[PDB]
Enzyme design. Sequence first.
Site, short mmCIF file in Angstrom:
data_model
loop_
_atom_site.label_atom_id
_atom_site.label_comp_id
_atom_site.label_asym_id
_atom_site.label_seq_id
_atom_site.Cartn_x
_atom_site.Cartn_y
_atom_site.Cartn_z
N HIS A 28 0.80 -1.23 0.00
CA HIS A 28 0.00 0.00 0.00
C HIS A 28 0.84 1.29 0.00
O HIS A 28 1.98 1.20 0.47
CB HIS A 28 -0.69 0.07 1.41
CG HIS A 28 -1.43 -1.20 1.76
ND1 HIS A 28 -1.26 -1.84 2.96
CD2 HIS A 28 -2.32 -1.98 1.08
CE1 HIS A 28 -2.00 -2.93 3.08
NE2 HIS A 28 -2.62 -3.05 1.92
N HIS A 56 1.33 4.58 1.95
CA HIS A 56 1.11 5.14 3.25
C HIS A 56 1.25 6.67 3.10
O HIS A 56 1.92 7.15 2.17
CB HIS A 56 1.98 4.61 4.35
CG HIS A 56 1.55 3.23 4.76
ND1 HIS A 56 1.25 2.93 6.07
CD2 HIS A 56 1.34 2.10 4.03
CE1 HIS A 56 0.90 1.66 6.16
NE2 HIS A 56 0.96 1.17 4.94
N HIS A 111 -2.60 4.46 5.77
CA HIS A 111 -2.75 4.45 4.33
C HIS A 111 -3.13 5.83 3.83
O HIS A 111 -3.89 6.50 4.54
CB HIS A 111 -3.88 3.54 3.84
CG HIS A 111 -3.38 2.16 4.13
ND1 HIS A 111 -4.15 1.02 4.15
CD2 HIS A 111 -2.12 1.77 4.44
CE1 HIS A 111 -3.44 -0.04 4.44
NE2 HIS A 111 -2.23 0.42 4.63
N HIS A 147 -10.81 0.95 4.59
CA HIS A 147 -9.91 0.10 3.85
C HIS A 147 -10.67 -0.87 2.93
O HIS A 147 -11.67 -1.44 3.36
CB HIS A 147 -9.03 -0.65 4.87
CG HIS A 147 -8.09 -1.58 4.18
ND1 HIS A 147 -6.91 -1.13 3.62
CD2 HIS A 147 -8.10 -2.90 3.91
CE1 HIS A 147 -6.25 -2.11 3.03
NE2 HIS A 147 -6.96 -3.22 3.18
N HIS A 207 -9.15 2.99 0.41
CA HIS A 207 -8.29 4.19 0.57
C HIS A 207 -7.60 4.42 -0.80
O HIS A 207 -7.48 3.43 -1.58
CB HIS A 207 -7.22 3.81 1.59
CG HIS A 207 -7.74 3.63 2.96
ND1 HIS A 207 -7.19 2.68 3.83
CD2 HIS A 207 -8.74 4.22 3.63
CE1 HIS A 207 -7.79 2.74 4.99
NE2 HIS A 207 -8.72 3.66 4.85
N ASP A 262 -4.76 1.82 -1.30
CA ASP A 262 -4.97 0.37 -1.29
C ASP A 262 -4.74 -0.28 -2.64
O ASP A 262 -5.58 -0.35 -3.56
CB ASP A 262 -6.44 0.13 -0.85
CG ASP A 262 -6.74 0.54 0.54
OD1 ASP A 262 -5.88 0.71 1.46
OD2 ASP A 262 -7.93 0.74 0.95
N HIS A 273 3.98 -5.35 3.24
CA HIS A 273 3.67 -5.92 4.53
C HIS A 273 3.91 -7.46 4.60
O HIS A 273 4.05 -8.21 3.65
CB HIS A 273 2.16 -5.66 4.81
CG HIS A 273 1.82 -4.25 5.10
ND1 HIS A 273 1.81 -3.69 6.34
CD2 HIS A 273 1.46 -3.25 4.23
CE1 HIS A 273 1.44 -2.41 6.29
NE2 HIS A 273 1.26 -2.15 5.00
N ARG A 294 5.37 -3.82 8.69
CA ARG A 294 5.98 -3.25 7.51
C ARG A 294 7.39 -3.83 7.35
O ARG A 294 8.32 -3.54 8.10
CB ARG A 294 6.09 -1.71 7.68
CG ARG A 294 4.71 -1.21 8.07
CD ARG A 294 4.75 0.22 8.51
NE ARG A 294 3.41 0.62 8.97
CZ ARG A 294 2.87 1.82 9.03
NH1 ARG A 294 3.46 2.97 8.64
NH2 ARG A 294 1.60 1.95 9.49
CU LIG Z 1 -0.25 -0.67 4.52
ZN LIG Z 2 -6.02 0.90 3.28
#
Ligand SMILES: [Cu+2]
Ligand SMILES: [Zn+2]
Lengths: 151, 151
Positions: free
Chosen positions: B44, B46, B61, B69, B78, B81, B118, B141
């Site tokens: 994602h 951030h 995010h 999400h 988001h 995403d 992730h 992360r």
């Molecule tokens: Cu993330």
């Molecule tokens: Zn998200």
Amino acid sequence: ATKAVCVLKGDGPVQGTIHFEAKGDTVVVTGSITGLTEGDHGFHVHQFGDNTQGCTSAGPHFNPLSKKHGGPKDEERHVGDLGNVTADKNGVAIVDIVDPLISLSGEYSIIGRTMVVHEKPDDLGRGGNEESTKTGNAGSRLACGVIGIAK
Amino acid sequence: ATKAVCVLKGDGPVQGTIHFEAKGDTVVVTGSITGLTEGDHGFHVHQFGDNTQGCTSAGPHFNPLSKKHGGPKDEERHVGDLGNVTADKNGVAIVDIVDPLISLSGEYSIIGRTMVVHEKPDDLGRGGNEESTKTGNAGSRLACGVIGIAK
Ligand SMILES: [Cu+2]
Ligand SMILES: [Zn+2]
Ligand SMILES: [Cu+2]
Ligand SMILES: [Zn+2]
């Protein structure tokens, strides 16, 4: 953005954190750099935020107005020319710059580009060889980081 | 900006280089990540391009529209995403994503923000719990990087 941050890292011991903040119509640059040799070191914004080959892929100085290299106070300078930072006996340089050419938005935005601290002093475009006119004879890139949006 | 690049690094073995290219009204995301455990990993954008505390200072995010999400194909998602990337037996994920929400310019621009890979699969908002609707339960992360302007 109104605030940006850059963490400098390289292959040696030089590291640091620089913050940028839009205050009024200008940008205030603050922070500190450690691990340096005593004396002046060229401190510039390089064009690309590309770190795929370390600091080398950052490219040349950010220069949207296609000028020659100079000092922060000259008319004829690259937008990325922030002069020198000075390391003390202990290798620590404190950054405190106000600059009228860089920005955190628009055409002169430096978000996404690279801050570089160099091995030698920047001669401010006055060294007298072709190289002075490009980089100020500042030499190799000791540490660099991509400038990102901060909270 | 029409092209961007991000180099992912962390404290373990995960590393990778992600490239971004604006095409029509979309961004094409390509690249590769290595050192990952076989399977799916959430991937994602951030919010902050702040690496002062590793991947942790990247914040949440990127969500300029204040939605919950979701997966990349969902309306309720988001902007950051992008789903999951899949590592093979050798730990290598090939990234090939086309996305219409993220942008390289304007209000949803991701230049200067952070790309994060992730530890676990992103459940796309369908995990049944509360965390599922914030992070997809993607866990920690593994590696991250600031998205910079590329040549
Ligand atoms: Cu993330
Ligand atoms: Zn998200
Ligand atoms: Cu330079
Ligand atoms: Zn210059």
